[PDB]
Structures are given as structure tokens and as C-alpha cells.
Amino acid sequence: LTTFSLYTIIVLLVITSLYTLTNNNNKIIGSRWLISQEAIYDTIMNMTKGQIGGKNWGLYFPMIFTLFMFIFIANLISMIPYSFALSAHLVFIISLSIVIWLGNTILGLYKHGWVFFSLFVPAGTPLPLVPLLVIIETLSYFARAISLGLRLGSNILAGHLLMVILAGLTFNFMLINLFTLVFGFVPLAMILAIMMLEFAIGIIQGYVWAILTASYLKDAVYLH
Amino acid sequence: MQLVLAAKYIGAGISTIGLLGAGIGIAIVFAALINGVSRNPSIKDTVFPMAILGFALSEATGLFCLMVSFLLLFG
Amino acid sequence: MQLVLAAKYIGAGISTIGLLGAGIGIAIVFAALINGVSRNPSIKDTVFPMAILGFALSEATGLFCLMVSFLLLFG
Amino acid sequence: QLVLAAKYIGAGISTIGLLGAGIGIAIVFAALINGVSRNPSIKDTVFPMAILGFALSEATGLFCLMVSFLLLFG
Amino acid sequence: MQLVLAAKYIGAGISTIGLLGAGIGIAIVFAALINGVSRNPSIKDTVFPMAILGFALSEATGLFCLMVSFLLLFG
Amino acid sequence: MQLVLAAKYIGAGISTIGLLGAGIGIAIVFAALINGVSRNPSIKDTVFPMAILGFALSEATGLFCLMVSFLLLFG
Amino acid sequence: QLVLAAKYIGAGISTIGLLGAGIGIAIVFAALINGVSRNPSIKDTVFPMAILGFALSEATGLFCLMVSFLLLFG
Amino acid sequence: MQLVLAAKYIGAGISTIGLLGAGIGIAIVFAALINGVSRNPSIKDTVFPMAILGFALSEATGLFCLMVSFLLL
Amino acid sequence: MQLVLAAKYIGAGISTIGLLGAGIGIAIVFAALINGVSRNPSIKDTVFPMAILGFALSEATGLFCLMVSFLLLFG
Amino acid sequence: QLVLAAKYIGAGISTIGLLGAGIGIAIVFAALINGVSRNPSIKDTVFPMAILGFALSEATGLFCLMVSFLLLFG
Amino acid sequence: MQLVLAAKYIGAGISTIGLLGAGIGIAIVFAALINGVSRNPSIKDTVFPMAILGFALSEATGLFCLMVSFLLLFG
Amino acid sequence: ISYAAYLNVAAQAIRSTELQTASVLNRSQTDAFYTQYKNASEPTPITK
Amino acid sequence: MPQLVPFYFMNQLTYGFLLMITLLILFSQFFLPMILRLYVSRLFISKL
Amino acid sequence: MLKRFPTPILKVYWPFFVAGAAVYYGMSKAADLSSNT
Amino acid sequence: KLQFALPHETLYSEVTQVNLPAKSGRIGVLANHVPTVEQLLPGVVEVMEGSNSKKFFISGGFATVQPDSQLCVTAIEAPLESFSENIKNLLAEAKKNVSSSREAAEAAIQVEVLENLQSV
């Protein structure tokens, strides 16, 4: 079939096993794998109660949880060496960002009427530069549109490409003269350090996604 | 002409340098926020609106730079 | 002439670099605002007009870079 | 040919822009450490503020990077 | 000849970089003002003439630069 | 031919310039770490993993610059 | 020909030197504002010193400006 | 030939610039060490390891710039 | 000839860049003078000649930079 | 002769790098004087530390210089 | 050769840039001196020897830049 | 001279418009003689 | 490159938007309220 | 184990879904134009 | 909370914003604030509990946010209205006194008080 289609299936199957094969039939005491997804549940519950913090925060608490977990699993799958990304197929992540951004813009229009453009008066400021601050607030409003997706996309794509380029160099490092085969473990360790870093910047990015589109959702639900 | 088309691709690169300034700038405003809020924990509610105004303006200088880049790119 | 048309577009890109300085400037003013408000809790009524004035003047210098850029780019 | 050369050269130029972002991220984190060390107890309010500030700092750098990519690929 | 006209427009761009310094400079003077008022509001009236003086002098270096920009650009 | 290969080498060199800011960045986070820890004697256990996070993030910006340098250098 | 172009470019590059002096001037004045706010009363001694510090910082910039005119006019 | 060989020499030169940030970086770390030690006194035994760690990481960024110069050479 | 003479002028322009650091430098000495004098109220009789020494030394680097510029410029 | 031109140019570009070390070195000694003036007594512990840092900051500048000579000579 | 002699003059200009760093550097040491001495008063006896050491190496970095500049310039 | 001596002088200055009360005035006027003693020995009871 | 620019975008996006809606419903109705149940159960015994 | 606890999502997430259909359609056309090359 | 306490008074020994003139310039303390000890310079003080504000002229002292949100302010003697024309006349004489005669520092402090009084 299609590698992308097959890996969308792998993400679904990983997520299904994480709330089935992790505890047996609900044991109150808790089972060691499920302790992780308790802490994740709580720190995003108390975070988006911290952000949007309405009474509809919990209505967007599943949404912010599946925006976490999607990015969280798809930046472990792409970290497998022989594996074909979903998230580093940028077109889905950037498109998803634009969907959420438009669904914020429409939500803002719905919630804050035609006085939605009062959002683009940032604060009470001198009147001869009130219109300026509408232009360069709206410019920033759809700079917010692409930043959120492209941040995550660039980090993951660049990380894998960096590792692969260094791997290709280290292939030829270990296929040339024996003085280069001395300290042959040191480039392997260097690539390993980057691989450790690439997990870090992906997991932080899932949190950055979910705080940033909580900040945007704060803007969209409540005026400012 | 190869020279004119080339000039767009070089010139775009040159433009991109300017954006860096706003980037440092954004961080500076946020740094002050963190320190400020630490120094008086209850200042947070007053200051946070001020912070968002400042963020937008500091960022805006970067945006203007990026617009000129796009004019060379797609001009 | 191909050189001259390319030179116009290039000169614009170079000018775009100038914006960065104003960008750092904006941040410095707002950082000061945040620090000051933390000191007094209450200076802001006086200081906020001064801050807007300071912002405008810093911004104006940035705009001087921008107008030279547009003279080169368009003109 | 001249146009192709210009893409590769042009791309290089754009990369200088990233340096500012690199400094920026650090400034937010330094402030995080300063704030945390100053209050102790501010950490829970300040930590989400700091991550947001980090993200925004990163965003300007990201735009520089995207112009670089755009020239490289076309 | 074309090279001369090219050099004028390129050179115009190059000079524009000098303006960035003044953009930071204006902000520094206003930052000092903001901090001064917040640290002692009784200083404010004394500091304000000195602030305007320092602002003008800082800005001036940039305005000299901007005139050089027009000397290159127009010729 | 020669020009394209040359162009690749030049662009790579320019890209190396990008890295410097991240280098300084790593130091800045560590400086804050030392200064904070000397203030509290005790913040350190909480702050140390936070400091590592800030380090990684700063470093990553530099990694992006480097990988772009590699794309131009190696192809 | 090439020489004419060269003096215009060289003049451009020399103008950049001014940047440092402009920053310099503000740093002296910033310290003036900071000092006077600290003492309320340092100012009588300091105000002459501040004009001195300003002049000297500015003087470096004036060297930049005259080189620019020496290329451009000369 | 000439253009490519020239480009190698030039490209190497540009690569040296990246190192300057690390140089300054190292200084900042040691400055912090001195400041910390002067502030606390007694913090030093914990703080000195932290300073060494920060030093090493700063140096690594510069090292990357340096090796790229060597490759171009 | 045209290229060599041109190169004198270009090289001179480039040389003038170095001066910017000295401009900031003098200010750093004098800022410390003002700040210092506000710190002691009374150190000043020692500190004023000490400061002039500091000024001169920072300035000297500037003069060296200017010298190379003059050697290129005048020939 | 393009290659020979480039050889001399390459040396020049490498010379730029040294400016950073000049600032850096000063920062280490600035810290020394600040620390020592606040404590007095810290100086005996701090001076070995200062010398270590001094050497390290310098070494980066030495590398930049080393490439200048390496390019110049070939 | 026109190209080589040109490259020497241009190259000389580039070398002069290195000096800026020493200019700022020297000023930083002297700034710390004036601040430190005004804070303590009497630290000066120890500190003046320390200050000469710091001055010397900062200056020396400048001298390294300078000698390369002369080497290119003269031949 | 001490920091609190500075504050003391300030407190005395503060008992200077005219809307004052006796207890205030008494708080800033007191009579005492510090007799600096010595090792038996004793420099005079010099007014405080 | 395939990991850079493909042109398979609508094919990709069809399977992509399907995976998102699947996970959204799946989390929201099934797996999240089963965590909220663990919390409430622990608290109900805690209350009793 | 698994149990459906209904969550109102129609009344919550309608603007998101409207945006999804529009972007889906616009990207369908974009994909067809990009698969030409 | 707040304690504004003195030997012979216990003014404000709840309170929401207090505005103080301190060695750190002028300081405002509002709700939770970082736990500090700062010597208050000779001062014009405003204490606000809600919007209501009470104004004190204060001989300096020490200020200490305690980590239990007890703002201990201790000073020797305060109301602003009680302190504050005849005093300006007396202080003028005291300014003369610095010329003639520790007493130099004392009279200098009196001049400082005259500046503070002028602020009132």
C-alpha cells in the first residue's frame, strides 16, 4: 500500500494499546505504565484550566490531549531509523495548523461578533496610531497561523536530516584509512547525542504546540 | 535575465538577517516579565496586558523586515 | 542595465538589515517598563505616556531604514 | 548557471539571521532561572510564562530558517 | 558607466546599516528615564531635560548617516 | 560546473556564522544557573533539569544552522 | 570607471563606523540619568564629566565621518 | 579549477567566524563562576563542576565551526 | 590600476568598521566613571585621573585602527 | 593568480574573529575586579580560577588566528 | 598583479576590523576597575596590578590583529 | 556615628509644624551623662 | 526527495484527517473518561 | 473496561469542522495542481 | 496584612498596597512580595488599605516583608499632617548651622529633612 497510510494506522494502534494494555480491567491502585498517562492527564488538565480556564476548558481538554498525543507518538515513530514520517510530512502538520487557526478565527468571529476587530486594537493607546496597531496586529495574527505548525515540522525534519547526513559522513569516515578508524566511536557518540536531543525537542514541541494553541484558544474564546 | 533572477535569490538572503534583531527583542521583553513577576508576584495581572502590547510591537519590527524579504522573493 | 536593475533590488535587501537595531530598541523600552512597574506597583500612569513616546521615536528610526529600502526596491 | 549559484549563496546569507534567535532563547531561560532563584515560589506561575516566551523567541528564528529553506529548494 | 550607477544604489543600501545603531540608542536613553522615574519619582523633573538632550544627541549620529545615504543614493 | 561547486562552498561558510549566537546562548543559561544557585544555596535540585532543558533548546537552534551548513557543504 | 564606483562603495562601508559612536553617546547619557537618580545630587560634579565622556565617545565617530567624506568628496 | 580552489580557501575563512561566539561564551561561564564564588563564598564546591559543564558545552559549538573550517581545508 | 586604486578605496571603507568598537568603548569607561562616582561620592579625586588613563588606553586601539585606514587612504 | 589573491583574502577574513576574544578576556578580568572589590578576601581562591578562564577564552582567539596563518602560508 | 595588489589593500581593511574587539575589551576592564574601586575604596592596591594584567592581554589581542593588518598592507 | 544615629537626628527633626504635644517634645529631650569608666578608673561623666 | 517534496498531498491528507477524527472521538468518549473514573473512584473511597 | 461516556462535541467543535472541510477542498485542488508537475 | 509600628505608636500594627521610600529608591509592596529586609530612608509614606490611603511622614526605619506576608515596618516616629512652615524657618537656621559645626552630618541630615519637608 502507501507507507504514509500504513503509519497512520500504526499511530492509531499504539494509542489504542496505551489505554487497554496498560492495566487490567481497572485496578484502583494503578499499574506502572498507566502512571505516566495519569501525570500527563493531570498536567494538561491543570494547564488548560490554567490557560483558557473558562468552564469550557474541559470541553477542549480532550482536544488538547489528542493534539498532545498525536505529536507525542508521531515523534517516536519517526525516530525509528528505517521509518517514514507522518509529521515530517509537513503538509499534514502545517495543514492541521491552518485548520485549527481558521477554526479559531471563525470561533473568534462567532464569539466576538463583528467587534472581533476590537481584538486587533491590542490596548488603549493614542488614537493616531490605533489603526497602525490594527494592521500590525492582524499581520501578526496570521503570522501566528503558520508559526505553530512550522515550528514543530522544521525541528523534526531537520533533526532526522541532520542525523542522516552525519551518518553518511561517518560511513565514509569508517571506510577510509586506519588513522580515521582510530576514534571511530566518537562520531557514533556524537550522532547518538543528537538523537537524544531530537527526542527532547520533539517532546517539548508537543507541549509548545499545546500551550500555544491554548494561548490562541484563550484569544478565540474570550476577547483577548 | 539570469542576473536579475539571481539578484532576487541573493537579496532575499540579505534581507533575512534583519529579522534577528526583533528575535532578540522578543526575548528581552519576556525576560523582564519573568523577573518582574518574581519581584512582586501580584504584579502579574497588571503587567501581563502591558507585556502583550510590548510583545506585539517588538515582533512587528521583525515582521516589516520579513515583508521586504517576500517582496524580493515574489517580486 | 541588467546590473543596475539587479543593483536596485540588492540595495533594498542590504537596507533591510538596518531594521534589526530598532527591533532591539523596542524591547529595551518595554523591559524597562516592566522592571519599573515592579518597583512601584503604581508608577505606570506617569511612565506609560513616556513609554509610548520612547517607542514612537525608536520606531521612527526603524522606519528611516524602511523608506530607503522601498526607494531602492520600488524606485 | 548564475541563477543556481545564487540560490546556494543566497541560502547561506539567510542563515546569519538564526544567530539572534539562539541568543534570544537563552535570555528567556536565564530569566527563568533568575526569577525562580529570586522568589523560590514563583515557579508554577512563571514556568508556563517562560515556555510561551521561549516559543515566540523560537518563532522569529524559524522564519529566518524558512526563508533559507525556500531559497534552497526554490 | 552602468557600474557607477549600480555602485550608487548598492552603496546606498550599505550606509543604511548605520541607522540601526541609533535605533537602539534612542531606546537606551528612554529606558534610563523610565528606570529613573520608577526608582525615585522626585528625580523625574530634573532627569527629563537631560533625557531629551541625550535622545537628540544619540539620534543625531543616525541622522548624519541618513544624509550620507541620500548623498550616495541620489549622488 | 565550477561556479555551482564554488557557490555551494561559499554558502556553507556563510551558514557557519549562524552558529555563534547559540554558543553564547548555552553560556548565558549556565551563567544564570551559577548565579541562581549561589543566591539560594538550595534551588539547584529543581533548577538543574530546567537548566538542561534551556541548554538543549539553545543548542538546537545551532544544530539547525549546522545542518544547513552541511546541506550546502556536502550537498 | 571602476575607481569611481569604488569610492562610492568604500564611502558606504566607512559610514557604518558611525554606528558605534551613536551607541556610545547613549551609554554615557544613560549613566548620567542613572547617577543623578541614585544621588539626587551627584549632578553638579557629574554633569561636566558627562559632557566630557560624550565628547570623547563622539570623537571616535567623527573619525569615521571624516574618513567617509575623504573617500566620497575626496 | 581556480574558482573551486579559491572558493575552498574563502569558505574556510568564513567558517572561523563561528568560533568567536564560543570564545565569548567560555568567558561568560568563568565570569559567572567568579561572581558566584565572590557572592556566596561557600557555594564553590558544587558550583565549580557546573561551571566546567557549561564550559564544555560552549566549547562544543565552537568546535563544530572549527571542524567545518578544517574540512574546507 | 583601476582595480588597484579601487581596492585602496574599498579597503579603506572596510578598515573604518573597526572604529565602532572604540566608540562604544569610551562610553563604557565613562559610564563606569559616572556610576562609580555615584557609588562613592568621594573616590573621585583618585578615580578621575584613573578614568582618564582608562579612556586613553581604550582610545589608543581606535587610533591604531585609524592609522591603517590613513595608510590605505592617503597612501 | 585568483588562488593567490584568495589566499591573502582568506587570511584577512580570519583576522576578524580575534575581536571577540578581546571582549571576552576583558569580561573575565572585569568579573575578577568586581568580585574582589565586593569581598576583598575572595581574591586568593578566585585568582587561580580567573587565570584558568583567561587562558580558555584566549585559546578560542588563538584558533581563529591559527587559521589566519594557516591560510596565509597555505 | 592588479588582482593581488588590490587583494592586499582590501584584505588590509578586513584585518583592521579585529581591533574593535580590543577597544571594547580595554574599556570593560577599566569599567570594572572604576566600579570596584568606588565600591571598596581601598581595594585599589591589589586591584591596580590585576587591572594592568587584564589590560595587557586585551591590548595584546588587538596587537595580533594589527600585526596581521600590517603584514597584508605592506606585503 | 551610626545609621541609627542618623535616624535619631531625623526623629528629632520630625518633632519640628507647631501642632506638637508634650510627650513628643519629651521624647526628643533627655538628660544623661555617659561616664566612660575604665579598668576603677573613669573618665568624667561627659554629657550624653 | 520523498521526505521533502512529494506531490501525494490529497492522498496523504485524506488518511491524515481521518486519523485525527478517529483519535479525537476515541480519547474523548472512551479513554479519557476512564481516567476520570480512576480519579473519582480513588476519591470516593477516600471520602468513605 | 472501555465504556462510552458521551461528550458533546457537535456543539463544541462545529467551527473546527467547517474549517476542515474548506481546507480539505482547497488542498484537494492544490494537490491536483501539484501532481501535474 | 502589615505592621506599621513604632515605640510609642502602633499605627497599622487587610492592608493592601504600601508605598515606602527605601534605600532601594521607592518601593511599593502589594499582596505577596518577595521576602526582603530594606532600611527605609527618611520618608513620606502612604499606606493604602483598599483604596483608602493614610499619609505618614516617617523618620526612616526598616522594612521587612516576612515570608508569612507580614510587612513589618518599624520606624521611630510618624501623621504627615502633624509634621506639616515654621519648621521650614527652623530648618533654614539648621542649614546655616552645618557651616559652623558629627554636627556637620547632623545638620546635613536636617537639610535632607528639609528636602523631604519641601516634598510635603
Curated annotation (Swiss-Prot), chain A:
It is found in: Mitochondrion inner membrane. GO terms for biological process: proton motive force-driven ATP synthesis. The keyword Oxidoreductase does not apply. Pfam families: ATP-synt_A (PF00119). InterPro entries: ATP_synth_F0_asu, ATP_synth_F0_asu_AS, ATP_synth_F0_asu_bact/mt, F0_ATP_A_sf. GO terms for molecular function: proton transmembrane transporter activity. Mitochondrial membrane ATP synthase (F(1)F(0) ATP synthase or Complex V) produces ATP from ADP in the presence of a proton gradient across the membrane which is generated by electron transport complexes of the respiratory chain. F-type ATPases consist of two structural domains, F(1) - containing the extramembraneous catalytic core and F(0) - containing the membrane proton channel, linked together by a central stalk and a peripheral stalk. During catalysis, ATP synthesis in the catalytic domain of F(1) is coupled via a rotary mechanism of the central stalk subunits to proton translocation. Changing M196I: In strain: D273-10B/A1. GO terms for cellular component: mitochondrial inner membrane; mitochondrion; proton-transporting ATP synthase complex. The keyword Cell inner membrane does not apply. Keywords: ATP synthesis, CF(0), Hydrogen ion transport, Ion transport, Membrane, Mitochondrion, Mitochondrion inner membrane, Transmembrane, Transmembrane helix, Transport. It is a multi-pass membrane protein. Belongs to the ATPase A chain family. This is ATP synthase subunit a. The chain crosses the membrane at residues 1-21, 57-77, 90-110, 115-135, 156-176, 181-201.
From Swiss-Prot, chains B, C, E, F, I, K:
The record marks E59 as: Reversibly protonated during proton transport. It is found in: Mitochondrion membrane. The modification N-formylmethionine is found at M1. Changing L53F: In strain: DS400/A3, DS401 and oligomycin-resistant mutant. Disulfide bonds: none annotated. Keywords: CF(0), Formylation, Hydrogen ion transport, Ion transport, Lipid-binding, Membrane, Mitochondrion, Transmembrane, Transmembrane helix, Transport. GO terms for molecular function: identical protein binding; lipid binding; proton transmembrane transporter activity. One of its GO terms (cellular component) is mitochondrial inner membrane. It is a multi-pass membrane protein. GO terms for biological process: proton motive force-driven ATP synthesis. The keyword Glycoprotein does not apply. The chain crosses the membrane at residues 14-34, 52-72. The keyword Zinc does not apply. Changing L57V: In oligomycin-resistant mutant and cross-resistance to venturicidin. It comes from the Eukaryota. Mitochondrial membrane ATP synthase (F(1)F(0) ATP synthase or Complex V) produces ATP from ADP in the presence of a proton gradient across the membrane which is generated by electron transport complexes of the respiratory chain. F-type ATPases consist of two structural domains, F(1) - containing the extramembraneous catalytic core and F(0) - containing the membrane proton channel, linked together by a central stalk and a peripheral stalk. During catalysis, ATP synthesis in the catalytic domain of F(1) is coupled via a rotary mechanism of the central stalk subunits to proton translocation. PANTHER family: ATP SYNTHASE LIPID-BINDING PROTEIN, MITOCHONDRIAL (PTHR10031), ATPASE PROTEIN 9 (PTHR10031:SF0). HAMAP family: ATP_synth_c_bact (MF_01396).
Curated annotation (Swiss-Prot), chain L:
CDD domains: F1-ATPase_epsilon. It comes from Saccharomyces cerevisiae (strain ATCC 204508 / S288c) (Baker's yeast). Gene3D superfamilies: ATP synthase, F1 complex, epsilon subunit superfamily, mitochondrial. The keyword Electron transport does not apply. The gene is ATP15. This is ATP synthase subunit epsilon, mitochondrial. F-type ATPases have 2 components, CF(1) - the catalytic core - and CF(0) - the membrane proton channel. CF(1) has five subunits: alpha(3), beta(3), gamma(1), delta(1), epsilon(1). CF(0) has three main subunits: a, b and c. Its main location: mitochondrion. Keywords: ATP synthesis, CF(1), Hydrogen ion transport, Ion transport, Membrane, Mitochondrion, Mitochondrion inner membrane, Phosphoprotein, Transport. It is found in: Mitochondrion; Mitochondrion inner membrane. GO terms for molecular function: proton-transporting ATP synthase activity, rotational mechanism. Pfam families: ATP-synt_Eps (PF04627). The lineage of its organism: Eukaryota, Fungi, Dikarya, Ascomycota, Saccharomycotina. The keyword Protein transport does not apply. One of its GO terms (cellular component) is proton-transporting ATP synthase complex. Present with 4280 molecules/cell in log phase SD medium.
UniProtKB/Swiss-Prot annotation, chain M:
It is a single-pass membrane protein. It holds the Pfam family Fun_ATP-synt_8. It is found in: Mitochondrion membrane. Keywords: ATP synthesis, CF(0), Hydrogen ion transport, Ion transport, Membrane, Mitochondrion, Transmembrane, Transmembrane helix, Transport. One of its GO terms (cellular component) is mitochondrion. The chain crosses the membrane at residues 13-32. The keyword Hydrolase does not apply. One of its GO terms (molecular function) is proton transmembrane transporter activity. Belongs to the ATPase protein 8 family. Mitochondrial membrane ATP synthase (F(1)F(0) ATP synthase or Complex V) produces ATP from ADP in the presence of a proton gradient across the membrane which is generated by electron transport complexes of the respiratory chain. F-type ATPases consist of two structural domains, F(1) - containing the extramembraneous catalytic core and F(0) - containing the membrane proton channel, linked together by a central stalk and a peripheral stalk. During catalysis, ATP synthesis in the catalytic domain of F(1) is coupled via a rotary mechanism of the central stalk subunits to proton translocation. This is ATP synthase protein 8. It comes from Saccharomyces cerevisiae (strain ATCC 204508 / S288c) (Baker's yeast).
